[PDB]
Amino acid sequence: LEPGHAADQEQAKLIRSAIEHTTLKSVTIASEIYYDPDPRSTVIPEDEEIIQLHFSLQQSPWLLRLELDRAAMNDKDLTMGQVGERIKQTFKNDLFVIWSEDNDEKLIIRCRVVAEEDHMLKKIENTMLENITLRGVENIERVVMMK
Amino acid sequence: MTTFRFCRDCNNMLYPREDKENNRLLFECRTCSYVEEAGSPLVYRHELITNIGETAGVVQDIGSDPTLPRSDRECPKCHSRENVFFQSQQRRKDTSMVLFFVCLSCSHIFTSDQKNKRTQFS
Amino acid sequence: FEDESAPITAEDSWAVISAFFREKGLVSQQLDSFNQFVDYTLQDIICEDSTLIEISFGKIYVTKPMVNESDGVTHALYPQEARLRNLTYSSGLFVDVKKRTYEKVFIGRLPIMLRSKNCYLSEATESDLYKLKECPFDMGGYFIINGSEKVLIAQERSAGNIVQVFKKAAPSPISHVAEIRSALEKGSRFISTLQVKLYGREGSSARTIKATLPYIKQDIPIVIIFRALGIIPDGEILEHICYDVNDWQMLEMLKPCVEDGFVIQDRETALDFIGRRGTALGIKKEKRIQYAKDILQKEFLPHITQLEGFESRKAFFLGYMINRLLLCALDRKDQDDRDHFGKKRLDLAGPLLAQLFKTLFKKLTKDIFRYMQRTVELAINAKTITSGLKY
Amino acid sequence: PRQLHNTHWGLVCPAETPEGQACGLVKNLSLMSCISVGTDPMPIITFLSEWGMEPLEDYVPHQSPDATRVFVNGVWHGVHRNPARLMETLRTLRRKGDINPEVSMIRDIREKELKIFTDAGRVYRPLFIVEDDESLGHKELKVRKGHIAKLMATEYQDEYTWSSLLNEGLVEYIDAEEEESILIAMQPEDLEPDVDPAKRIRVSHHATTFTHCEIHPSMILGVAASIIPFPDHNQSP
Amino acid sequence: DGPTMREITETIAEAKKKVLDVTKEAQANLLTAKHGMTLRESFEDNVVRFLNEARDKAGRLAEVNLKDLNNVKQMVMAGSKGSFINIAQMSACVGQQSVEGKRIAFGFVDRTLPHFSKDDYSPESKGFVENSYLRGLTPQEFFFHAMGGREGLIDTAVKTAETGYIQR
Ligand SMILES: [Zn+2]
Ligand SMILES: [Zn+2]
């Protein structure tokens, strides 16, 4: 670590999480594809508050839904916004992405392709879990602190 | 938990299809012309972190298995002290070392996981 | 007074052990193996391919050990003399042929294992042994060839007819494989190998499952093999693989399998699919379909059956391999341990002597066939065997 | 392959292997090992269906998921509900002698399988049977002083024999495969329902499951090592 | 020393408690995995650290004891053949066996030998040899010590072969 910062167990940890490669697959609990046709009202209860809350200051009826885990989330210093805006900045305009906020009790990401839908999705689901880099450097896997 | 169905006539796998007018989910057959409405909207599920498999092996004769360990704890149901117990039957590296017990009187499955998160253990 | 129902003590163990060695000695592995051959395995080989297009072979008799003398009577041969005289402690092998026209007999020599039922020392008393110049302390699980004492070291090898799933190196496109190396116990041990491979690794699009049949130049999707076997509906097939309806994870794993077999919807198209991957381009449909039926009947899981009406037996077994293969890819079971001794096997005198003796009895059988085609109008090379073994 | 595996216990010597190249690839059989010679499975396969083994021909999984599947020498012959009583009978037949001792029968309760082996080449050793068909106390070895008396009587007369012990269900032959399903006690004394500080430190008998007992632990050794005095006080190599 | 041997037995007994606790801990699911490590991985780690700490402290108690008359100690003090580890394995605990850097593995399904119950991760099960060579090893201890022994024989053959070609 940089000269004037070698006793900071706190910075060590920061740099650790900024090096240790982290994919979406390392933070995801499970993924599901639903038939949820009305981009306004949802067939999923828990997601009502999230589609509402996204109207303050094209899309296929098929929904890819990921459930993320807080432990791994806050552990690897990651924000719902970071994760989401990273996925978004990956699939061009070729994908509609929305996500619950850091306050909600459930971390969720919803995605719609933007007809062979069901198929492209299971492929996109794959690219997301393995290829997208949320944080870290390629190839660097474990990363440990020692004194 | 996507429990899927088969055709009524030709008994083949059904595939999800969209009724674009009333916006609902169907399941057609690609052999005959059969087609039905969907039970739930869930069409696919992928559990990166799973639980199923942990209890595999709980059989009626499990008590007669001599290689299994025995304890005398109490089961949350019949308080009978006749138990047989094993660790997670999944074979993943990232598993815990929690124990699963089987009441040999009422065959109830309980656990030593103080963070017990599930209700059925299946 | 010494209650005969009183528990046994640690010291009492040696009594049970002395009893063990009094009856078996120290080389029962050798004796027993060789005896099972000479007493059963031998006769069984004489009944396999024992008929020619007739001449059929029947019963076999085995002589006590003796020598072929140059300028003299056939002498009784004892081990001591065979060692000194650089001889071979063998015995006469006589068969019983049934010559019948269609459109005893001496046959080779068998080297005999000392102290086996056949040897002259097996029934010898202590003094009989001394007068014979054979130490009463000798154990005898060996042979005497050209005067030198020879031992057949046990050969350890993997057991046959056993399913085994294995993971695979990150490079290869096949993430898992379920293998069985079927082989018939008797007759002719045809080790045709069946492999059920799972294409694609965790995170690859549509992980498919294909099997490798013998004489077929392309891995075949499993759904197609099930239909070639008479199990047509997806429903019926999955049931042969997944014996639990709630296991949605496993059934999900086969979804791409079903799709990979869609084109084929009936038994004949399934058989033709296969027949074409094992036939040249100018062969006729029937011939093809026939080729595939014969393959699934004799080259496919031969340890189960080689007859006809047993396609449900092979379907369920094939389903069982697929089951265990997925049980591993689903991280519910660990890949099999290739080093578990319970799945190994040790070949000894008998089994070993049975590979050579089969192979040789089959060459003695070819020759006898070349004594008919070439005969437009007793022609038996006994040495074919006496040399093969001896060698 | 050249590593000393857990399943080698009692079947192959843990010490006698050569140095260098052949190390771990050339092995030696333990004093009491034997290798199966081979037997016909017909009678067993016949008896199996005579005892309720539903043919695989008429088996419907979605209809009887609990069913235990039975194999014989690798072949799946069928299914059987309530395998418990069949296994009891199977063990009794082999312990009488009606089923050749050499035959190996394994039931995996949790795995829902019953595998039988009749082929040659299988390595096995003998153990004391520890069934609890005795009332007076608890689980005990079936060999009692009276038996040993007969054994030693026959010795002195140089007719109760090793085969006698086998026939009267007192001892059994066990291969690595079957070994998986049992629980073996080291010293018969441990089935027992201020300590010598000079003795070595041994573990405790927390068992009521015992199914067998080692005739004597020193029999895991082969011929060469059986000649080393106090081998248990030496460094392994 | 008679009392020393007692200080040694207790030292090991104290090790088996620390191990027993971490087990109950793990079984209740209270152990926290160390970053970039599995529950099971860090569990094993602590158990092995405990078991070596034991062999070692057990060994020091024996070393200190021995008088200056003790011939083994006389040889060690001079520099001619000898070392702590030797006195430790002969007089006090022999220690934990191991193959491929880990404790003895479950070669049979979920157990090291048919003599144990399934899912037994205790020290006696997975290969800790409690006795010294003087006391003698139990049969299970003996087999485990032979598993570990074979390892050294195998790669001693390797190290040998590989080094001869590297040198040339
Ligand atoms: Zn249909
Ligand atoms: Zn209960």
Q: At residue B88, what are phi and psi to the nearest 5 degrees?
A: -45, 130
Residue of A nearest to B21 (CA): A37
Q: How far apart are CA E46 and CA E26, in angstroms?
A: 11
The shortest C-alpha distance from B66 to chain D (Å) reads 5
D212 close to D128: Cβ distance less than 8 angstroms: yes
Interchain pair C346, D123: CB under 8 A: yes
Q: Diameter of chain C by CA atoms? A: 90
B5 close to B27: Cβ distance less than 8 angstroms: yes
Instruction: List all residues 6 or more positions away from D195 whose beta carbon is below 8 Å from its beta carbon.
Output: none
**CA proximity to C114, closest of C138, C137, C148, C147:** C138
**CA proximity to C295, closest of C269, C277, C317:** C277
Residues of A whose CB is below 8 A from C205 = 122-123, 126
C203 in contact with A, Cβ within 8 Å: yes
**Domain match, C321 and C373 both:** no
Instruction: List all residues 6 or more positions away from B36 whose beta carbon is below 8 Å from its beta carbon.
Output: B5, B8, B14, B26, B27
Q: At residue A41, what are phi and psi to the nearest 5 degrees?
A: -80, 145
Question: What single DSSP character describes residue C172?
Answer: S
A69 close to A80: Cβ distance less than 8 angstroms: no
**Domain match, C100 and C210 both:** no
User: Beta strand C344-347 with D113-117: parallel, antiparallel or unpaired?
Assistant: unpaired
Q: What is the dihedral of CA C296, C301, C307, C308, to 10 degrees?
A: -40
Residues of C whose CB is below 8 A from A126 = 203, 205
- H-helix segments, chain C: 13-24, 28-36, 42-45, 79-84, 126-131, 222-228, 234-241, 248-259, 267-276, 285-298, 311-329, 349-369, 383-390
Q: Which structure tokens are listed for B18?
A: 């969209």
Interchain pair C203, A129: CB under 8 A: yes
Q: How far apart are CA D123 and CA D12, in angstroms?
A: 9
Cβ–Cβ contacts within 10 Å for residue E120, how many?
15
C169-198 residues touching D, CB cutoff 8 A: 180, 182, 185
Check which CATH number belongs to the domain holding E132 and give it. 1.10.132.30
Q: How far apart are CA B65 and CA E97, in angstroms?
A: 30
Residues of E whose CB is below 8 A from A143 = 36
Q: Which structure tokens are listed for D152?
A: 């030693």
**Domain match, C383 and C291 both:** no
E144 close to D232: Cβ distance less than 8 angstroms: no
Q: At residue E102, what are phi and psi to the nearest 5 degrees?
A: -125, 175
Q: CA dist C64 to C32, C112, C113, C129, Å?
A: 18, 9, 12, 17
Q: Which structure tokens are listed for C91?
A: 């015995």
Interchain pair B46, A125: CB under 8 A: yes
Least distant ligand from the CA of B102: 2
Amino acid sitting at position E134: L
Task: Report the residue from B69, B94, B113 with minimal CB separation from E118.
Answer: B69
E79-105 in b/e burial notation, b at 16+ Cβ within 10 A? eeebeeebbbbbbbbbbbbbbeeebbb
**Domain match, C175 and C125 both:** no
Q: Determine the distance separating the centroid of ligand 2 and the alpha carbon of B76, expressed in angstroms.
A: 6
B76 close to B89: Cβ distance less than 8 angstroms: no
D touches A, CB cut-off 8 Å, minimum 3 pairs = no
Q: How far apart are CA D141 and CA D134, in angstroms?
A: 9
Backbone CA torsion sign across B34, B35, B39, B44: positive
Residue of C nearest to D70 (CA): C317
Instruction: List all residues 6 or more positions away from C226 whose beta carbon is below 8 Å from its beta carbon.
Output: C232, C237, C240, C270, C315, C318, C319
The shortest C-alpha distance from B103 to chain C (Å) reads 23
Residue of E nearest to D25 (CA): E154
**CA proximity to C111, closest of C140, C138, C84, C144:** C144
Interchain pair E36, A143: CB under 8 A: yes
For helices E2-28 and E39-65, the axis angle rounded to 10 degrees is 170
Instruction: List all residues 6 or more positions away from B115 whose beta carbon is below 8 Å from its beta carbon.
Output: E29
Residues of B whose CB is below 8 A from A30 = 45-49
Q: Determine the distance separating the centroid of ligand 2 and the alpha carbon of E90, expressed in angstroms.
A: 50
Q: What is the dihedral of CA D235, E4, E6, E11, to 10 degrees?
A: -70
Three-state secondary structure call for residue C98: strand
**CA proximity to C254, closest of C182, C180, C330:** C330
B5-43 in b/e burial notation, b at 16+ Cβ within 10 A? ebbeebbbbbbbebeeeeeebebebebeebeeebeebbb
User: Beta strand D54-55 with E95-96: parallel, antiparallel or unpaired?
Assistant: unpaired
| β-sheet bridge partners, residue C57 | C97
- H-helix segments, chain A: 9-17, 48-52, 70-75, 80-88, 117-130
Q: Which structure tokens are listed for D147?
A: 């038996």
The shortest C-alpha distance from A12 to chain B (Å) reads 25
Chain D residues within 8 angstroms (CB to CB) of chain B: 66, 83-84, 109-112, 180-183, 208-211
Fold of D38-119: Hypothetical Protein Ta0175; Chain: A, domain 2 (3.90.1070)
**CA proximity to C218, closest of C205, C233, C235, C199:** C199
Cβ–Cβ contacts within 10 Å for residue C310, how many?
15
Cα within 13 Å of Cα(C324), Cβ side: 21
Backbone CA torsion sign across C4, C6, C12, C17: positive
Question: Mutate which of B4, B18, B27 to test chain A, going by most A C-beta atoms within 10 A?
Answer: B18
Q: Which structure tokens are listed for C196?
A: 């059920």
Q: CA dist E94 to B50, E67, E98, Å?
A: 41, 21, 12
Q: Determine the distance separating the centroid of ligand 2 and the alpha carbon of B79, expressed in angstroms.
A: 6
C89 close to C143: Cβ distance less than 8 angstroms: yes
Question: What single DSSP character describes residue B6?
Answer: B
| β-sheet bridge partners, residue C180 | C194
User: Beta strand A28-35 with C344-347: parallel, antiparallel or unpaired?
Assistant: unpaired
Interchain pair D148, C160: CB under 8 A: no
- Chain E neighbors (3+ CB pairs < 8 Å): A, B, D
Residues of D whose CB is below 8 A from C342 = 7, 122, 175-177, 179-180
| Technique that determined the structure | X-ray
Amino acid sitting at position D116: I
Question: What single DSSP character describes residue E110?
Answer: T
Chain E residues within 8 angstroms (CB to CB) of chain D: 2, 5-6, 9, 89, 99, 104-109, 112-115, 117, 124, 130-131, 133-140, 142-143, 145-154, 157
Residues of B whose CB is below 8 A from D180 = 67
User: Beta strand D184-185 with D68-72: parallel, antiparallel or unpaired?
Assistant: unpaired
C343 in contact with D, Cβ within 8 Å: yes
Q: CA dist B85 to B10, B100, C379, D182, Å?
A: 45, 5, 72, 16
**CA proximity to D7, closest of E96, C341, B10, E88:** C341
E-strand ranges in D74-150 read 75-80, 104-108, 113-117, 123-129
Q: Determine the distance separating the centroid of ligand 2 and the alpha carbon of B61, expressed in angstroms.
A: 16
B32 close to B63: Cβ distance less than 8 angstroms: no
State which residues form the domain around A97.
22-136
Q: How far apart are CA D183 and CA D209, in angstroms?
A: 7
Instruction: List all residues 6 or more positions away from A13 whose beta carbon is below 8 Å from its beta carbon.
Output: A145
Q: How far apart are CA E79 and CA E51, in angstroms?
A: 29
**Domain match, C223 and C181 both:** yes
**CA proximity to D99, closest of D175, D169, D10:** D169
Residues of D whose CB is below 8 A from E139 = 186, 214, 217-218, 220, 232
Question: What single DSSP character describes residue C343?
Answer: G
Question: What single DSSP character describes residue E108?
Answer: B
Q: What is the dihedral of CA C137, C143, C148, C153, to 10 degrees?
A: -90
E-strand ranges in A17-103 read 22-23, 28-35, 62-68, 95-99
Task: Report the residue from A28, A35, A38 with minimal CB separation from B43.
Answer: A35
E20-39 residues touching A, CB cutoff 8 A: 35-36
| β-sheet bridge partners, residue B16 | B27
D touches E, CB cut-off 8 Å, minimum 3 pairs = yes
Check which CATH number belongs to the domain holding A93 and give it. 3.30.1360.140
Interchain pair C205, A126: CB under 8 A: yes
State which residues form the domain around E45.
1-138
* Domains detected in chain B: 1-46 (2.20.25.10), 47-122 (2.20.25.10)
Amino acid sitting at position D212: H
Q: How far apart are CA A119 and CA B15, in angstroms?
A: 12
Identify the residue whose tokens are 């070698």.
A6
Q: CA dist E42 to D20, E32, E37, E38, E111, Å?
A: 36, 9, 6, 6, 20
The shortest C-alpha distance from E26 to chain B (Å) reads 6
Residues of B whose CB is below 8 A from D110 = 56-59, 62, 65
Region of C229 on the Ramachandran plot (φ > 0 left; ψ -120 to 50 alpha; else beta): alpha
> How is B27-69 classified by DSSP, letter by letter?
EE-SSSS-EEE-SSSEEEEEESS--TTTTTT--GGGGG-TTS-
C170 in contact with A, Cβ within 8 Å: no
State which residues form the domain around C76.
28-140+349-391
B46-68 in b/e burial notation, b at 16+ Cβ within 10 A? bebebebbbbbbbbebbbebbbb
> How is C18-61 classified by DSSP, letter by letter?
HHHHHHH-S-HHHHHHHHHIIIIIHHHHTTTT-B----EEEEEE
Q: How far apart are CA C224 and CA E57, in angstroms?
A: 66
D174 close to D11: Cβ distance less than 8 angstroms: no
Q: CA dist E108 to C40, D140, D209, E41, E113, Å?
A: 35, 25, 18, 21, 7
User: Beta strand A107-113 with A133-135: parallel, antiparallel or unpaired?
Assistant: unpaired
Q: What is the dihedral of CA D143, D149, D155, D161, to 10 degrees?
A: -40
